[PDB]
Amino acid sequence: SERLAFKMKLNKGQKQAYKERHDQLWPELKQLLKDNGVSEYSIFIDEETNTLFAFQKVSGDLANNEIVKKWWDFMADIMQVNPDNSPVSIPLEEVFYME
Amino acid sequence: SERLAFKMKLNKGQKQAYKERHDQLWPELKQLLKDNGVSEYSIFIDEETNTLFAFQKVSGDLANNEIVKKWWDFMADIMQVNPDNSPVSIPLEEVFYME
């Protein structure tokens, strides 16, 4: 019901690892995201700037979920992350929408 | 049927003008986009970097359309544009999708 977008940062040269790990995204994480109202979740890359742009829809607390935290730990070597291994994330404000 | 994303550049300090002009997007342009298979077209801003991230769905030649070109001309003072007034646009490759 709501559209959300955000920017993340990949470490230089890690597009391949990022893509392969996401091709093998744990089914537990996919189901948790769905159970929490997430759909149509896409992540796009600007490889030359090591930038990820994420878009998702949310239909109404994953940061405290054990599986999410395990995913952060698994990804922390190739992403720009905080001390708790969650990815740095910059929110992006919607300025236009046409259905 | 296809998801597309791309990055554009706004001139410094022009978020307000960009948003107001898009709130008043010409109905002719909305209809042309729909007629050409575009839906769920969102544009998000990272204001501190003057960056626009666009997402849209396309269900199967707008660059040569007179109304599109008029829109480019109308917007050219506040966007980073080419000599023909079309916005500079960097495509972003999808690296993850979960329906």
From Swiss-Prot, chains A, B:
It catalyses: alpha-L-rhamnose = beta-L-rhamnose. Pathway: Carbohydrate metabolism; L-rhamnose metabolism. Its EC number is 5.1.3.32. The keyword Isomerase applies. InterPro entries: Dimeric_a/b-barrel (IPR011008), L-rhamnose_mutarotase (IPR013448), Rham/fucose_mutarotase (IPR008000). It is found in: Cytoplasm. The active site is at H22 (proton donor). It is an enzyme of class 5 (isomerase). One of its GO terms (cellular component) is cytoplasm. Pfam families: rhaM (PF05336). Keywords: Carbohydrate metabolism, Cytoplasm, Isomerase, Rhamnose metabolism. The keyword Hydrolase does not apply. GO terms for biological process: rhamnose catabolic process. Homodimer. L-rhamnose mutarotase involved in ulvan degradation. Ulvan is the main polysaccharide component of the Ulvales (green seaweed) cell wall. It is composed of disaccharide building blocks comprising 3-sulfated rhamnose (Rha3S) linked to D-glucuronic acid (GlcA), L-iduronic acid (IduA), or D-xylose (Xyl). L-rhamnose mutarotase catalyzes the anomeric conversion of alpha- to beta-L-rhamnose. HAMAP family: L_rham_rotase. This is L-rhamnose mutarotase.
